[PDB]
């Protein structure tokens, strides 16, 4: 029985020349067999391009093969970062898989012509982030293991004070967005639907051709206001000038790449009205869309002559007289909240100001309180009663404070996170309609007007009905209570309470707590629970599993990066990603140039124990369950021991921590007593490094500080890597007993 | 007959009544329905005292303690209008208003000789205090706006001032070391005798309460305050409330937790001048100064001391401010603070006051300004945060669209912590503090207690907690409103009675009704998100929180607490109706012989009738009484929408005609009725009589002069002069 482990890219590739050989030896007396599959860029690129190819310069296409592995119930997948290739990486890579003398073409950035057309859709499928669709089929179970857990409450990360006079808030509007006029349904047939706009004087424009929906699929008609939003933007704006107080506005423009950059642009525009309406005449002729940033304003008026420029500037300073206060991104480079909708990135800033004890940073460098304003009322609310909870109970206790794991619904793109391709900016006032296009029935229609923002949502019902499942299981294997959150007065939440409410009863719920309550209703109930050491598991959408697995995190931990990211797939198998960040390229430069890696493999050493224990649970194996328990209890010990990395050369890197991981973990499989056969295989090795612990860290210092010859970067050499990664003469002896 | 008991009291209460009661068994004879008196005035209550002095047309039946035995009578029907309190020198001047019209009284001089001047001093110390209400409210608090007052509302909605989303105004509550979180209690299966002991360090055994007779079923706490705790949070807060620059406060209620308030407000004074006291202290010793009832005191006190000191202490005093927070105002401009009295900032009035204004306490320079609102005491404290977290967010409320919050409360046999008078002590040393079993030695309930800490036992015995009930479903039934138990399972006493409710709430058919129960805290904001939707929430509360919630919530709904339905339903069946808990304001007494003007007390009536009425409906079901309810109603409605309420002027409006108008319109109403041919009206002698001449009446008593009229007494008067004023026309009793 296999657990397939993914080869992938630049820092933490590395690591697992180095983890995977203890990974391989832990696990074979389970009888564990563990393949690798590379998924790199430079082995995707390849796939792609086979036609380009020698018969043994060929290269199996691995994410195809993962992809229909997702059906197989027996799978187990290990997935660990991985470049999601910008352009620039991808021409870096094709130029060096050329240097080794892979004849594929060149990238036409710009195509002239016949082929250059076709390839650089065909280096598409490489660009971006190709692998997480294919691979990530069947819903979240997020949540923190003990391990860091409990290290967690013996040492407590930093909590700012909140005062109970705080003036931060949270700022939202109160009718004209998206929830408020927000209208849904769950079909109960097959159709295949248009969304149309008549123009308010006939015209019939479509915006969205057809859109294929199933029974049981719920779909929703949303849309935000553009002059609610600008008045709610006035009013707020004069509100907080009024309060002398920080100005901050916090939203998700790298998910919701239509829908929000408009949001953000008119806050751009209205904050600097005065300012706009002289030179809008020069801003539309210059091709400046403020939507993507303020940034963008500036870099244009650099060709404008050092007068009309200057005059500019001036006139956009004088805004500031009559405008609050902005946060900043660079308080000391005067970056403001306005230079890229990309910086202030919601669910990140949101925790890390409340963190921060409601604090944001002014362009003197200094902290005062703020107006978080989130437009949009539907996910906003949740903040604001978590805010309203510290000024009374001060800042969180990590000391004490219990777990909010979070099951979340987000299979094939559900919900909000599906619409990209389906919203759009209102051309002109009339009526937006989802239409049957086989039938010209009308399902849902919209009240709109012009430069309004439309979006049709759907989520299908396998997704949802996994979703219950795994709530009941999640409640049942934990005994934590489950809360559904869910507001009835939002027409799709309604929908879902619908389902849930059916569903539950496909399951056994006796033992359990399972509960449906209001987003803020539930948001409370599980802080009154956190704040008493107990824990709860938030049930919630695919916007809110995003939200709170940053959010409830940050609190209990310090970071959000510390977490089992498990997708329990549809056909009963796993996947285990080990991380939510990069490959982290600045890891590679310290390893080739003076051999030190300061990668941390902690999300590794985490997914690897669920994996084992879930393969315990399902597969019936004792084995299993004890390399699990006991990778619990030498994780934790690592953590104890300090014996994570450091960021420093000379000192401890990714290899000694696996190292001591490998000595904890050994010593733990050597001191049970649950399996006799398995500490019999054990015990010699638990002594091998044990005794020789210095020996070999001594093996292990002594490389660095010299350089490290990978032979490559987007195509490492196995050798070359397998030697820098694995160098300890003594360590490598160890491993090669256990009888 | 099924009849209404309807009282005559004292003062301007009495007087309206001598004029708006034969404008009822009017409108009621039709109904089948009878009007006795019962006069339990102070005046009349003396007398029934003090008898054996009298001869035998002047002696009267005692009616205080004939309604005392009517309360257990599964029909009677009460109409109870304010009445005054007795006091020092108001039984005094009218311990003599018949030794001027020929009655044989002893009279009352303290500072006695040798024994009856004792025992006639305990024997009129009877009609002293608040000795009529008890007598009366056997049975729990049934507290609701009633349909008249709270249409008028939304029609004519007073102001809310604004709440901004960065208000800093807040609740500043002990989290450790008070009442709550240290909490014991228990419910008895055994009736026992217990005794409050406290067991020293050294092993002295001190008993601070001999003797508590406890039944079976009661629930029993016992809490305490810990004065390391509680000073440490005035001081911790003190701090706060500076680096804040806002202003600081201290709700409490001291006029009924008259032992342990006061101790924790005179430990805030102390605290926030322990500067100027820890240096003057020995001679505010030797002066008597006991800041426990306030800075007020302390000044009358240092008037003694020469002016070279008693200024030298005034500036030490005054230099603590330097270091301190700003003080919210009693009074700006006679510069009185916070810490003048302890009845002055009245928690459950001075807190929705505040919220009402936005989140406001008066600065020193008669402005209006933030501030720290410090209950020290957690328990009843979390919920007035709640609901201003709740305004910072959503702006504070619109009584236009707003719902409503009545009441259910439980405080039959002084329930809760509103008995717990004679059981609350300042612990002398440190040590143990035990209820202990004076039969079996057993110890029940333990806590340990150092020097000055504050240690009370509350008891609620089960009688009231079931009627409680069954009062909470009868109201959910008769209503379709749902109602919310408000009890904090983490509070050892309400999670002492969650089990109670859970138990007796199977006891009633509630197949119908939405009865659920909630933290107070919960509670209070699921019934917050309604309100705001323009839904209804019943109330279903402790003693305290019927006290707090029954001015919080119609301040929001009506700016005053004083227009509310108060009926007791009494623990036999009956019921009785209180017009108000307003004073009998005698100050309202001269406007009507000086002059002739009075006030607008009258409301209150109107509706306590409305009430007795509806629910003499169903209890002796009465088609004949359903009617003039919702007539009544009808009518009170809009002697509102018509301006027609008494008036401060002399032209003018008072009881007089708003006192007739209804009669008008109680009329208007029954003869242009359809749904029955009985009470066709018949009722005809018609309201257009009151039409005929309806700006007459008027005027006939317009002239009726103000210069003087005499009740030819005042608290004692007769029975045939108050007719030539309160009935002066001569075409009013007329038709
Ligand atoms: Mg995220
Ligand atoms: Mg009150």
């Not at 250059?116 to 691979?135: D, F, H, M, Q």
């Not at 408009?262 to 539309?284: M, N, Q, R, S, T």
């Not at 094939?412 to 051309?427: C, L, N, V, W």
């Not at 690897?608 to 393969?615: D, I, K, N, P, Q």
Request: hydrophobic share 40%.
């Amino acid at each position: 029985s296999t657990i397939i482990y993914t080869l992938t890219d630049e820092a933490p590739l590395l690591a697992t020349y180095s983890l995977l050989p203890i990974i391989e030896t832990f696990t074979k007396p389970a009888g564990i067999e563990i393949v690798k599959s590379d998924i790199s860029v430079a082995a995707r690129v390849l796939a792609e391009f086979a036609d380009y190819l020698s018969e043994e310069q060929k290269v199996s296409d691995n994410l195809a093969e993962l992809g229909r592995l997702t059906q197989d119930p027996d799978t187990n997948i290990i997935k660990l970062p991985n470049i999601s290739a910008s352009v620039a990486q991808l021409t870096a890579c094709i130029k060096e898989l050329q240097s080794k003398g892979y004849a594929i073409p060149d990238y036409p950035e710009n195509p002239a012509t016949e082929e250059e057309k076709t390839i650089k859709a065909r280096y598409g499928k490489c660009l971006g982030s190709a692998v997480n669709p294919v691979l990530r089929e069947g819903n979240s179970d997020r949540r923190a293991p003990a391990a860091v857990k409990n290290y967690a409450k013996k040492h407590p990360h930093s909590m700012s004070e909140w005062k109970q006079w705080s003036q931060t808030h949270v700022s939202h509007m109160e009718e004209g967005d998206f929830y408020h006029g927000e209208k849904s349904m769950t079909l109960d047939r097959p159709r295949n639907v248009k969304m149309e706009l008549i123009t308010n004087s006939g015209k019939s424009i479509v915006l969205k051709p057809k859109v294929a929906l199933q029974e049981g699929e719920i779909i929703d008609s949303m849309f935000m206001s553009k002059k609610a939003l600008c008045d709610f933007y006035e009013k707020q704006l004069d509100d907080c000038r009024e309060a002398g107080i920080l100005f901050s506005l916090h939203v998700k423009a790298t998910m919701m790449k239509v829908s929000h950059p408009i949001v953000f642009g008119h806050c751009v525009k209205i904050y600097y009205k005065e300012a706009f309406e002289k030179h809008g005449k020069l801003f539309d002729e210059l091709g400046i869309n403020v939507n993507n940033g303020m940034a963008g304003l500036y870099e244009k008026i650099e060709t404008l002559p050092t007068s009309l420029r200057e005059e500019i500037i001036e006139d956009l300073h004088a805004c500031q007289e009559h405008r609050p206060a902005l946060a900043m991104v660079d308080s000391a480079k005067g970056i403001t909240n306005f230079h890229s909708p990309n910086d202030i990135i919601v669910d990140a800033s949101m925790p890390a100001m409340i963190r921060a004890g409601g604090k944001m940073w002014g362009a003197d460098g200094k902290q005062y309180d703020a107006k978080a304003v989130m437009p949009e009322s539907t996910f906003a609310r949740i903040y604001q009663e978590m805010i309203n909870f510290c000024k009374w109970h001060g800042n969180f206790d990590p000391k004490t404070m219990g777990t909010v794991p979070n099951v979340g619904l987000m299979a094939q793109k559900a919900e909000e996170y599906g619409s990209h391709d389906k919203t759009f900016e209102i051309p002109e006032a009339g009526i937006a309609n989802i239409t049957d296009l086989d039938t010209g029935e009308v399902l849902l229609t919209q009240n709109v007007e012009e430069g309004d923002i439309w979006r049709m949502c759907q989520v299908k019902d396998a997704p949802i009905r996994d979703w219950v499942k795994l709530a009941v299981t999640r409640a049942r294997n934990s005994g934590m209570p489950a809360i559904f959150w869910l507001d009835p007065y939002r027409p799709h939440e309604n929908e879902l309470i619908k389902k849930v409410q059916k569903y539950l009863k496909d399951h056994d719920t006796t033992g359990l707590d399972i509960q449906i309550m209001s987003q803020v209703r539930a948001m409370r109930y599980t802080l009154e629970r956190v704040v008493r050491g107990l824990d709860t598991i938030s049930v919630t959408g695919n916007i809110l599993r995003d939200y709170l697995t940053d959010l409830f995190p940050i609190m209990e931990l310090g970071t959000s990066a510390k977490m089992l990211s498990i997708v329990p797939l549809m056909a009963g198998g796993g996947m285990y990603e080990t991380g939510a960040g990069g490959s982290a390229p600045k890891h590679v430069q310290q390893l080739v140039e003076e051999n030190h890696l300061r990668w941390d493999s902690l999300g590794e050493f985490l997914a690897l124990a669920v994996s084992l224990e879930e393969m315990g649970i399902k597969e019936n194996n004792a084995r299993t369950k004890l390399l699990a328990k006991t990778l619990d209890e030498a994780t934790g010990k690592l953590l104890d021991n300090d014996k994570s990395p450091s960021r420093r050369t000379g000192e401890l890197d990714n290899r000694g921590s696996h190292f001591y991981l490998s000595l904890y973990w050994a010593e733990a499989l050597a001191a049970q007593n649950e399996d006799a056969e398995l500490k019999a295989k054990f015990a010699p090795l638990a002594k091998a490094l044990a005794e020789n612990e210095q020996k070999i860290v001594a093996e292990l210092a002594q490389v660095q500080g010299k350089p490290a010859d990978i032979g490559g970067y987007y195509a490492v050499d196995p050798a070359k890597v397998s030697a820098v990664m694995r160098p300890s003469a003594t360590f490598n002896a160890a491993l090669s007993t256990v009888q």
